[PDB]
Amino acid sequence: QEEDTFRELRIFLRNVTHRLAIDKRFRVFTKPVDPDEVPDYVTVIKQPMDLSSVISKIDLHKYLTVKDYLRDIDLICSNALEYNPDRDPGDRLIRHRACALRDTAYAIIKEELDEDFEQLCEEIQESR
Ligand SMILES: Cn1c(=O)ccc2ccccc21
């Protein structure tokens, strides 16, 4: 029954993630940064994160709340802002997309997540 709650949370998180993942603006965030393509990445960004990995984490029951989930979404975003801070187009584009990923994710959750559902998730997690 609490099990039911987390399963529902997972169903909700997979759907939101799929909707972000098929958005063409967010293509760059769908897969881990390839270390051959970007050799120093794994040096600078201590905690890589991507939408692929977010899917795996959902399935590994790593998110017990929407808060936990959005921490990883924000981490996708802050990684991009930190790794790509320059004034050039390539960096400004990724940053702009990073911010849109973040805001879209929040906006979907704000319209579609019941807050009492979140609150329940939080209270079950707090009791374990
Ligand atoms: C997320 N990201 C970056 O933040 C920087 C370079 C890059 C290259 C290929 C794929 C993803 C990339």
Curated annotation (Swiss-Prot):
Span of domain Bromo: 1-112
Subcellular location per the Swiss-Prot or TrEMBL entry: Nucleus
Stimuli inducing this protein: Up-regulated in breast, uterus, colon, ovary, and stomach tumors. Induced in breast cancer cells overexpressing NCOA3 or treated with estrogen. Down-regulated in 5-fluorouracil-resistant derivatives of the colon cancer cell line HCT 116.
Coiled-coil stretches: 106-128
Lineage: superkingdom: Eukaryota
Tissue: Highly expressed in estrogen receptor positive breast tumors and in osteosarcoma tumors.
Covalent S-S links between cysteines: none
Purpose: May be a transcriptional coactivator of the nuclear receptor ESR1 required to induce the expression of a subset of estradiol target genes, such as CCND1, MYC and E2F1. May play a role in the recruitment or occupancy of CREBBP at some ESR1 target gene promoters. May be required for histone hyperacetylation. Involved in the estrogen-induced cell proliferation and cell cycle progression of breast cancer cells.
Family: Belongs to the AAA ATPase family.
Complexes and interactors: Interacts with ESR1 and NCOA3 and these interactions are enhanced by estradiol. Interacts with acetylated lysine residues on histone H1.4, H2A, H2B and H3 (in vitro).
Name recorded for this polypeptide: ATPase family AAA domain-containing protein 2
Species whose genome carries this gene: Homo sapiens
Whole-protein residues included: 981 to 1108 of 1390
